[PDB]
Amino acid sequence: LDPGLQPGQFSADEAGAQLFAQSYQSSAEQVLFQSVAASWAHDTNITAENARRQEEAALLSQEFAEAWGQKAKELYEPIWQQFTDPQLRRIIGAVRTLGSANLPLAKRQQYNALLSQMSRIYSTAKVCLATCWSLDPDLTNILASSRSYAMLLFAWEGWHNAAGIPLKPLYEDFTALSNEAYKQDGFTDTGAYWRSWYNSPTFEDDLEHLYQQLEPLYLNLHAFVRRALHRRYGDRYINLRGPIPAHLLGDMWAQSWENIYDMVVPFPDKPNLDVTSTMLQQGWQATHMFRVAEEFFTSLELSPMPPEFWEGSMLEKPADGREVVCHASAWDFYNRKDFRIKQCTRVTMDQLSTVHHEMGHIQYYLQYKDLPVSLRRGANPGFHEAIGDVLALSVSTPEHLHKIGLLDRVTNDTESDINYLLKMALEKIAFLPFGYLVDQWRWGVFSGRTPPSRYNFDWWYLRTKYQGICPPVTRNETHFDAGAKFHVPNVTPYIRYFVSFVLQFQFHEALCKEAGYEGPLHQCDIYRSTKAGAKLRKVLRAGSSRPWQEVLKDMVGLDALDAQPLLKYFQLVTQWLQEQNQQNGEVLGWPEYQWHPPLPDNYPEGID
Amino acid sequence: QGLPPRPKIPP
Ligand SMILES: *[C@@H]1O[C@H](CO[C@@H]2O[C@@H](C)[C@@H](O)[C@@H](O)[C@@H]2O)[C@@H](O[C@@H]2O[C@H](CO)[C@@H](O[C@@H]3O[C@H](CO)[C@@H](O)[C@H](O)[C@@H]3O)[C@H](O)[C@H]2NC(C)=O)[C@H](O)[C@H]1NC(C)=O
Ligand SMILES: *[C@@H]1O[C@H](CO[C@@H]2O[C@@H](C)[C@@H](O)[C@@H](O)[C@@H]2O)[C@@H](O[C@@H]2O[C@H](CO)[C@@H](O)[C@H](O)[C@H]2NC(C)=O)[C@H](O)[C@H]1NC(C)=O
Ligand SMILES: *[C@@H]1O[C@H](CO)[C@@H](O[C@@H]2O[C@H](CO)[C@@H](O)[C@H](O)[C@H]2NC(C)=O)[C@H](O)[C@H]1NC(C)=O
Ligand SMILES: [Cl-]
Ligand SMILES: [Cl-]
Ligand SMILES: [Mg+2]
Ligand SMILES: [Zn+2]
């Protein structure tokens, strides 16, 4: 560790801890910057050499973290919990958590190499046949727009086999080392550490109680979509009393169903709420999507994107051939100047929403950039995920789309409302079971309830249990279908997305009230509301300096996650779908839980 | 801990 970066001496008391934290931040920023920079260099340009550079920077971060972590514990282990300065306790608590820095060198190097290799495998995997499709954009567009069962099956099977199978032995090794590292921080396993970020002794029970309130909405959306799919694909491939084949819902993970909106739209005579074609017809490109997102933020008197963002960001997939991580992401370089987005942006309505999601991350970074480095986080991770989604809730309203030139015809009638709420349910309600289940899978892997011998058995158990889908071809424990989802090999926790899909409607309700809006929750548009901007700004500027329950209370009047705002937003379509399924005599659920569809005849033969 | 926090990404 360079001498400038090493901790000196500080007294063993709260006034020394404060000087400790100030000396820390000085050097932390440099170490974070070099780490993030090397990660950026790799993720925008996947090369063996860039992976080597990224691993060296990771090792330096581990060295730094160990030195300052062990100093924090040497000087403050039994007194930091009683510090009078609550932000200083949060700072000290973070610095003394060593994570992978608890591992011996050789195991640190093994750990960093496993992260690199799992990342390279996921983001460079291809499906072939010899020319080859990448996940983004090739397979993505096939899942979104093909309606050929055999073709969707070719993309779904090909991707899951190509990405998941080679990852499995690496993921086993990563789990063991991760657990070894965090057990030396006092946690029973890594998942317990991840869950600790919500500082709630009843987290899993609280989530289970939210899901109980939401599940009826998903069950009715599912039954209704399943009927629509049956009318297109027929009784051979859709079982009206079984799970839906997992490749037919518009998305490689069946996690958002927006893309099948044209098959499910109940009133096709109303305005077409999927404005993708209008964006194409109009010549929208990535940089227009990012400027339109930015201007919503500035309409609220939040910050524009700095020049460093426009000069540094990667907003389209590189045409120079080179391999990149295409999964969108938002980057804080911890120097208070550089912030970027890396996105292989495609010109589509859901991508416009994803642009807002990612710019919400950036706005958080811009607003808390002057807090101590340790507090440059969301009040909890689900807060960070929710910011951009809240604005996107306003952007997608038919009235807002009209304002920005994407929907010439506007209508305020009950049919149009049901169309809109149904489209939003395909995006928001359909995701809830998946958002909930992914970290149930990973918590069980980390705790050892799901050993490698049951990785895929337990994944599909949860996928069927919650989402009511089945794999369209047979799977066994050679397959590792969880690894075919980006966040698993790239070790990004998931429960934040379940939390944010609940939270964002709590935020939306509060911001709409603050803006003086007095109509139905789902037609609210907070655009140009500076009062709403100021209320959002207060949350963003808090970072993680204060308990999330208190930040939430100041914002929305309640100190807990609550499904009532989401249920209020969707109420009309919740009632409509219930009525429809009854009249159609649907079975809610999937009691033929063993059912799987047959293979197409002439599969995979006829793919050319 | 140990490393920089993950870049923030969509579901
Ligand atoms: C779309 O239309 C709805 C419904 O409009 C209401 O019902 C129609 C059948 C017509 O009779 C309309 O004339 C009628 O207002 C609109 O929702 C309604 O918005 C108004 C505010 O614009 C709400 O009224 C207010 O109510 C609050 C108390 O809640 C009072 O303090 C205010 O002074 C004001 O009177 C009204 O409650 C609300 N109705 C419902 C059922 O939600 C909606 O605004 C409109 N949307 C767009 C984008 O135009
Ligand atoms: C686990 O599955 C793989 C592959 O399974 C595919 O799905 C099965 C239902 C069946 O249709 C397989 O033939 C499919 O390939 C099995 O591995 C393959 O096995 C076949 C048949 O023995 C063989 O021709 C292939 O070369 C094998 N490799 C691949 C990549 O297909 C595997 O044997 C199954 N069981 C175990 C324990 O792994
Ligand atoms: C992608 O990364 C590679 C390194 O793996 C970069 O290659 C270097 O490119 C410069 C010229 O631009 C040469 O001077 C170096 O010798 C190259 N290094 C190696 C190992 O070949 C490449 O520049 C990067 N691409 C982009 C677009 O940044
Ligand atoms: Cl966070
Ligand atoms: Cl999380
Ligand atoms: Mg789409
Ligand atoms: Zn995100």
Instruction: Determine contact, residues A394/A296, Cβ cutoff 8 Å.
Output: yes
Q: What is the identity of the amino acid at A114? A: L
Nearest-atom number in ligand 1 for the CA of A518 is 21
Contacts of A552 (CB under 8 A, 6+ apart): A379, A503, A506, A558, A559, A560
What technique was this entry resolved by?
X-ray
> Residue A461: helix, strand or coil by DSSP?
helix
For atom 14 of ligand 2, the residue with the nearest CA is: A474
Distance from C-alpha of A154 to C-alpha of A142, rounded to nearest angstrom:
10
Contacts of A167 (CB under 8 A, 6+ apart): A118, A121, A122, A480, A483, A488, A489
Cα–Cα nearest to A325, from A216, A152, A486: A486
Q: Using alpha carbons, select from A33, A31, A17 the residue that is nearest to residue A338.
A: A33
> Phi and psi dihedrals of A126, rounded to 5?
-135, 155
Determine contact, residues A482/A455, Cβ cutoff 8 Å. Answer: yes
Using the atom order of ligand 3, give the atom closest to the CA of residue A318: 27
Q: A133: which strand partners?
A: A127
Distance from CA of A94 to the nearest CA of B (A): 7
Q: Do A35 and B4 touch (CB under 8 A)?
A: yes
Looking from the CA of A306 toward its CB, the CA atoms found within 13 Å total 14
For residue A249, what are its two tokens? 């819902």
Q: Please state the domain extents for chain A.
A: 1-585
Residue length, chain B?
11
Q: Would you call A172 a catalytic residue per the annotation? A: no
Maximum CA pair distance of chain A? 75
If one residue of A153, A470, A474 were mutated to test the ligand 2 pocket, choosing by the most ligand atoms within 8 A of its CB, it would be A474
CA of A38 to the centre of ligand 3 (A): 13
Q: Residue written as tokens 């399943």?
A: A226
* Token representation of residue A482: 């969880």
Is residue A108 a contact partner of residue A59, using CB atoms and an 8 Å limit?
yes
Tell me the C-alpha distance between A171 and B6, whole Å.
17
Q: Among A341, A434, A344, which residue's Cα sits nearest to residue A388? A: A341
Q: What is the largest CA-CA distance in chain B?
A: 24
The neighbour count for residue A291, using CB atoms within 10 Å, is 13
Alpha carbon nearest to ligand 3 atom 24, residue: A45
- Residues 6 or more apart whose CB falls under 8 angstroms from that of A240 comprise A226, A227, A230, A586, A587
Helices marked H in A184-285: 190-196, 203-233, 261-264, 276-281
Length of chain A, in residues: 608
Contacts of A137 (CB under 8 A, 6+ apart): A317, A344, A346
Beta-carbon contacts of residue A95 (< 8 Å; ≥ 6 apart):
A21, A24, A68, A69, A72, A374
For the record, the structure tokens of A297 come out as 């933020």
Q: What is the resolution of this structure in A?
A: 1.8
Buried b (16+ CB within 10 A) or exposed e, A532-548: bbebbbebbebbbbebb
| Contact between residue A466 and residue A434 where contact means Cβ atoms under 8 Å apart | yes
The phi, psi pair for A128, rounded to 5°, reads -125, 165
The two structure tokens encoding residue A418: 């049901």
Among A53, A68, A54, which residue's Cα sits nearest to residue A5? A68
Residue nearest to atom 28 of ligand 2 (CA): A478
A99-113 in b/e form (b: 16+ CB < 10 A) is: bbbbbeeeebbebbb
Which residue is it, tokens 């055999």? A150
Choose among A484, A491, A478: nearest CA to A445: A491
Question: From the list B2, B7, B8, which residue is nearest A61 (CB)?
Answer: B2
Q: For residues A494 and A442, what is the distance between their CA atoms, to the nearest angstrom?
A: 9
How far is CA A192 from each of CA A133, A174, A179, A201, rounded to the nearest angstrom?
38, 16, 10, 11
Residues of A in contact with B4 (CB under 8 A): 32, 35-36, 39, 61, 334
Do residues A164 and A483 lie in contact, with contact meaning Cβ atoms separated by under 8 Å? yes
Residue A138 CA to residue A84 CA, distance in Å, equals 55
Burial grade of A580 (CB within 10 A; 0-12, 13-18, 19 or more): middle
DSSP secondary structure of A413-446? SHHHHHHHHHHHHHHHTTHHHHHHHHHHHHHHHH
Catalytic-residue membership of A427 = no
Chain A nearest-CA residue for B4: A32
Distance from C-alpha of A358 to C-alpha of A591, rounded to nearest angstrom: 39
Catalytic member of A288, A327, A487, A596: A487
What's the CA gap between A451 and A448, in Å, rounded? 6
The three-point CA angle A510-A309-A348 to 5° equals 65
B2, B7, B10: residue with CB nearest A354: B10
Selecting from B3, B4, B8 the residue whose C-beta is nearest the C-beta of A330 gives B8
Q: How many angstroms does the Cα of residue A328 sit away from the middle of ligand 7? A: 8
In the chain, the amino acid numbered A234 is: G
Contact between A480 and A118 (Cβ < 8 Å): no
Which residue in A has a C-alpha nearest to residue B9's C-alpha? A329
Closest to A391 (Cα-Cα) out of A446, A338, A353: A353
**Which residues of A are annotated as part of the binding site for chloride?**
198, 496
Between the alpha carbon of residue A2 and those of residues A74, A95, A151, A397, A510, the distances in Å are 21, 18, 55, 53, 48
Chain A residues whose CB is inside 8 A of the B5 CB are: 377
Q: Which residue has the tokens 């895929």?
A: A456
